[PDB]
Amino acid sequence: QLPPSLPSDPRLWSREDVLVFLRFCVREFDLPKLDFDLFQMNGKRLCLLTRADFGHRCPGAGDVLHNVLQMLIIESHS
């Protein structure tokens, strides 16, 4: 149920778009409390984070975030 207000290409996301993406992940995958201050970046930078980087900013569910983001990137490449 990806919010319709998000551009299909994650690299075009603004910082507020990134926030909306993370909120979606949180409620869609029942993730616990996420520290949104650790994701103050636009889509371009978000897509450059490594699995490890997500891991430091979210020890509990970084892999999920990273995986879902990659699927969107792939899904947009086509």
Swiss-Prot record:
Transmembrane region(s): none
Cellular localization per UniProt? Nucleus
Task: Consult the record and explain the modifications the protein receives after translation.
Answer: Phosphorylated in response to MAPK signaling. May be phosphorylated by rl.
Expression across tissues is:
Expressed in R7 and cone cells of the eye.
Instruction: Please state every residue range assigned to the domain named PNT.
Output: 1-76
Superkingdom as given in the UniProt entry: Eukaryota
What family does this belong to? Belongs to the ETS family.
Say what the protein does: Ets-related protein that functions as a negative regulator of photoreceptor development acting antagonistically to pnt and the proneural signal mediated by RAS. It acts upstream of SINA to inhibit R7 development.
**Further remark:** 'Pokkuri' means 'dropping dead' in Japanese. Flies lacking aop result in the differentiation of supernumerary photoreceptors in the eye.
The name under which this protein is listed is: Ets DNA-binding protein pokkuri
The beginning of the lineage is: Eukaryota, Metazoa, Ecdysozoa, Arthropoda, Hexapoda
What range of the intact protein is shown? 42 to 118 of 732
